[model samples]
Structure formats: structure tokens, C-alpha cells
Target: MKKIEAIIKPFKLDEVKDALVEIGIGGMTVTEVKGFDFLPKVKIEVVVRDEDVEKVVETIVKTAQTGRVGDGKIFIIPVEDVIRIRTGERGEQAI
Candidate 1:
């Protein structure tokens, strides 16, 4: 599995989220963040199966692009595991 962390302009949040959901992404985490100079941004974090990494990243980039500097960045990380506390679901099932 892999974790995708995308930092994008705040106003682009809804577009990005809707795009992700349209592509079958079930859930994700969203956070309000500040850049080095305190510029407002939104961080979107989601975990997906290995094969879905590229699709997810592309979706974010496509939906978040603005042809400007603050369009922000995306990070892809390796995920060792995921566990759902309520049901003890692990791995992809938990995700």
C-alpha cells in the first residue's frame, strides 16, 4: 500500500475531494496547513493499494492545477500497514 499526501491551494479542496470520490476513493484526511510564510493551504492524505498510487496522484494533480506557483505539491510514501480499531480490520481491508 502507499500513502499520498497532497498540499494544495485552499480553494481547490472541494474540487480535489470530489474528483477523488468520483474515482472510487472511499475516504481521506484533510487538514488546513500553512506554508513557510504562513500562506494558507490544504493537505489531503489518503492511503491506497500499490497499483492505485499513480491514479490517485494524477487525480490530485489534475484537479488541483492552477498554472501558478502555489499550486502546491504531492508526496507518495510507503505504508507498512493499516488497522481499524473498531473492527480489527488490517491491511487493505482496514484501508
Candidate 2:
């Protein structure tokens, strides 16, 4: 699995979400994340199959771009493992 952590301009949140959903992503973790030298932003974090990472990131970028500074950043992290506590599922199933 891969984890996609995207920090985007707050006003672009709705568009970003719609883009991701258009690509078939049904869920994500959204947070009112902050940065030291940046303006207020929205953080979207989600764990997806390795093959799904690139498309997700692309959608975020396509939707979040503002042709200006502080467009935010996207981090693709390696997820060693994932587990669902309620279902006792692990690996991709957990996500």
C-alpha cells in the first residue's frame, strides 16, 4: 500500500475531493492542517493500493493548482503495513 498526504489550499478542498471521487476514491482523512511559512491549508490523507497512488496524486494536483505560490505539497509515503482493528484485516484489505 501507499499513503498519499496532500496539503492543498483550503479553498480548493471541495474541487480536490470531487476530482478524487470522480476517479473512484470514496474516502479519505481530511484535516485543517497548518504550516510554518504557509497560509492555512487542508490536508487530505489516504492509504490506497500501490497502483492507485499516482492517479490520486495527479487528481489532487490537477484540482489544487492555482498558478501561484503555496499551492501546497503532496507526499507519497511507503506504508509498511495497515490493519483494520474491527475486522482483523491486514495489508491492502485493511485499507
Candidate 3:
């Protein structure tokens, strides 16, 4: 699995979310994060199976593109493990 962390312009939330959902991804954490040197932004954290990484990231980039600074950034990180608390499912099952 991979953890995708995206810091994006506040106004682009709906578009990004919709694009993600269109690709069969419906779960993610969206945080209204403020930074010391930048405008309002949202931090989106999503975990996806390894193979879905590129497409998901592409959707985000296309949806959030503004051809300018603050269009935001996306980070893909390796996830060693994941667990679903209630079901006690691990790894991909948990995801």
C-alpha cells in the first residue's frame, strides 16, 4: 500500500474529491491545515493499493492544476502496515 499526502489549495477540495471518487476511491482524510507562509490549504491523506498509486495521483494533479504556485503538492509514501480496528483485518484487507 501507499500513503498519499496532498497539500492543496482550499478551493480545490470538491474537484479533487470528486475526481477521486470517480475512480472508485471514497475514503480519505481531509484536514483544513494552516501554514505560516502560505494561503489556506487542505491536507488530504489517502491510502491505496500499490497499483492504484499513479492513477490516483494523476487524478489529483489534473483536478487541482492551476499552472501556478500553490496548486499544491502530493507525496507518495510507503506503508508498511494497516489495520482496521473494529474488524481486526490487516494489510490490504484492512485498507
The most accurate candidate by TM-score is 1
- Candidate 2 C-alpha error for residue 62, in Å: 0.4
> Candidate 1 clashing pairs?
none
Ordered by TM-score, highest first, the candidates read 1, 3, 2
Q: Tell me the whole-model lDDT of each prediction, alpha carbons only.
A: 0.93, 0.88, 0.90
Q: Once all C-alphas are superposed, what RMSD does model 1 give against the true structure? A: 0.9
State TM-scores per candidate: 0.96, 0.89, 0.93
**Candidate 1 error regions (>4 Å):** none
Which scores greater on lDDT, model 1 or model 3? Answer: 1
Error of 1 at 30 (Å): 0.7
Error of 3 at 71 (Å): 0.8
Error of 3 at 2 (Å): 0.6
Regarding TM-score, does 1 or 2 come out ahead? 1
Residue 59 displacement (Å), model 2: 0.6
Put down candidate 3 lDDT per residue, 1-95, tens digits, no spaces: 99999988888999999999999885899999875365789999999999999999999999999998768789999999988888999888887
Residue-level lDDT tens digits of model 2 in 1-95 = 88899999899999999898899885789999787455688999988999998899888888999989789899999999988888999997787
Per-residue error for 81 in candidate 2, Å, reads: 1.2
